[PDB]
Amino acid sequence: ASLKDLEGKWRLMESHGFEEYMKELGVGLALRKMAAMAKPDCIITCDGNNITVKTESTVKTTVFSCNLGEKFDETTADGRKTETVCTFQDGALVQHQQWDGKESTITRKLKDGKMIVECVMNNATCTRVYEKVQ
């Protein structure tokens, strides 16, 4: 699996543990239900080391653009202001966020033609499965 393998337009097909993950993040109920219901597309572009992740929905669209391994300031879809580093490790794009002495990691990996997005914060894990839009 490679970084360029992640590039493209992706649609959410399956989600597990998302609500609990968002609660661990501190997302309130109203916002949680909105997030869970509006099921996005995630557009990723990989121009060399320069990685852009755009998450699009009818309710909110967020984008970050980073260089691999360089720390950057991210404003997340729920409004957290984090310091983030993306790395590439064992076939996965690893996005590590830190804010308020807390941390979360989001891993994106191509498995069997699908993008698997694993989100961890503390004891709360979320798995989200995306498929490539034709």
Ligand X SMILES: CCCCCCCCCCCCCCCCCCCC(=O)NCCO
- Sites of contact with Cl ion (CB under 5 A): 75
Q: Whole-number minimum distance, CB 73 to Cl ion, in Å?
A: 7
Q: Nearest Cα to 22, choosing from 68, 79, 69?
A: 79
Closer CB to ligand X, 51 or 106, in the complex: 106
Helices H / strands E in the chain, number of each: 2, 10
Count of residues interacting with ligand X (CB under 6 A): 20
110-113 long-range CB contacts below 8 Å, 24 or more apart?
110/1, 110/2, 110/5, 110/6, 111/1
Residues numbered 65 to 124 that lie near ligand X (CB under 6 A) are 76-78, 106, 117, 119
Which of the stretches 24-32, 43-51, 67-75, 81-89 binds ligand X when contact is defined by CB under 6 A?
Answer: 24-32
Contact 79, 86 (CB under 8 A): no
At 39, list the tokens.
């099921």
The one of Cl ion, ligand X, none whose footprint includes residue 31, by CB under 5 to 8 A per kind, is ligand X
Q: How far is the CB of 133 from ligand X (least distance, A)?
A: 15
- Which residues contribute to the site for ligand X (CB under 6 A)? 22, 25, 27, 31, 34-35, 38, 40, 42, 55, 57, 59-60, 76-78, 106, 117, 119, 128
